[PDB]
């Protein structure tokens, strides 16, 4: 029908910003025709969008003002959008505005009575989109107009967690001030502290510790200290060790994991730190000859050269200068501390294999890749 093409014209006008031609196309219509043309879900570029939500997405605030003031377009009409590569089903205009960072459109929608806590199919509130993008102005304006900071999403991810993972320190501080629970756990038991420790954002860790966050072990069996050690975040490891009264086994575990992770991380490769942390943990294992904290080593792994992990300071000093042995020791310690739990520990193995292949030592590369594949099954 020609009304469908006219709805296409209206959608193009709203999606580009032309307020005058939009009012021209919407002029002297009937409320029936108004509702039809403004509720017609289109489909341009893998996005199913009604004129209001495409306008709010593209940040054309005067268009949204026309729609909200001269007409009364339904404020909770939903569609499907695309942010970079992600597809988002069940999004409202306010959510798209809060995500794309159009503070003017956010205010226009909130003032005219939009559901501030409307959720996505992934159960994402617009407050969570704002915390993702880091727009503290939008976060503040939403919270002021009674947006619920507690609403988690599909996988029980809060606004605090996504704010801590992305690094928006000021938004994290604001949320913590607004009585946001720092000990909120995700579906797997991970807190915002785990996410902040992985990314290395140390200021977020400082703020979370200031608000008395708790070091909980997630379902993967990892303290935030273990998360920081595994990710070669030495600053976070030192901070968490200083604040928490970690027992000697946890501290030695963290030191050994941090040292081992420095041996096969492409970004943080540092053999001297590897040996330093491994040797420090060994020394503290042998601090008291009458109370030696022995290490329950795993059986020899053929791909790692059938080598057994060093069990005393002499065995570790023996490989102080053997760079290859230190690589293999890092892999062994990573597998001993993490392999039991449900963790994909295969990536540094593949990296060490790739380096050995770059140096044309094909046999060891193939051994390492075979072991990684055997671990995956």
């Amino acid at each position: 029908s020609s009304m469908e093409g006219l709805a296409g014209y209206v959608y193009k006008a709203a999606s580009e910003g032309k307020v005058l031609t939009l009012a021209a196309l919407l002029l002297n219509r009937s409320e029936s025709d108004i509702r039809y043309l403004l509720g017609y879900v289109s489909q341009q570029g893998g996005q199913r969008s009604t004129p209001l939500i495409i306008a709010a997405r593209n940040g054309h605030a005067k268009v949204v003002r026309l729609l909200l003031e001269h007409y009364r377009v339904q404020t909770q009409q939903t569609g499907t959008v695309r942010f970079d590569g992600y597809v988002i089903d069940g999004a409202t205009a306010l959510w798209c505005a809060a995500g794309a960072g159009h503070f003017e459109v956010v205010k226009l929608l909130v003032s005219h009575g939009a559901n501030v806590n409307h959720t996505t199919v992934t159960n994402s509130t617009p407050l969570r989109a704002a915390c993702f993008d880091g727009r503290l102005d939008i976060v503040k304006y939403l919270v002021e107009n009674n947006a619920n900071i507690s609403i988690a999403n599909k996988y029980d991810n809060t606004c605090l967690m996504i704010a801590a993972y992305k690094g928006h320190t000021d938004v994290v501080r604001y949320l913590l001030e607004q009585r946001a629970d720092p000990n909120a756990k995700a579906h797997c038991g991970a807190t915002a502290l785990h996410f902040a420790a992985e990314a290395g954002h140390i200021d977020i860790v400082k703020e979370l510790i200031k608000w008395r966050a708790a070091i909980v072990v997630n379902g993967h069996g990892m303290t935030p200290l273990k998360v920081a050690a595994e990710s070669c975040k030495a600053d976070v490891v030192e901070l968490l060790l200083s604040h928490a009264d970690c027992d000697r086994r946890s501290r030695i575990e963290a030191l050994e994991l941090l040292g081992a992770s420095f041996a096969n991380d492409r970004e943080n490769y540092d053999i001297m730190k590897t040996y330093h942390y491994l040797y420090l943990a060994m020394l503290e294992r042998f601090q008291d000859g009458d109370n030696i904290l022995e290490k329950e080593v795993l059986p020899p792994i053929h791909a790692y050269g059938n080598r057994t992990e060093c069990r005393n300071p002499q065995e570790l000093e023996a490989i102080r200068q053997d760079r290859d042995a230190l690589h293999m020791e890092g892999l062994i310690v990573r597998e001993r501390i993490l392999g039991a739990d449900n963790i994909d520990v295969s990536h540094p193995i593949i990296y060490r294999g790739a380096v050995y292949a770059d140096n044309m030592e094909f046999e060891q590369c193939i051994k390492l890749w075979l072991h990684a594949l055997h671990l995956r099954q």
């Binding site: 996988y155 995700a186 996410f195 992985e198 997630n218 993967h220 449900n342």
Partner: peptide
């Protein structure tokens, strides 16, 4: 190339969401 709905490195979600 991780899921945006869960910021846990140790999960195993099907990318996408």
């Amino acid at each position: 190339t991780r899921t945006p709905n869960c910021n846990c490195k140790y999960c195993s979600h099907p990318v996408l969401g």
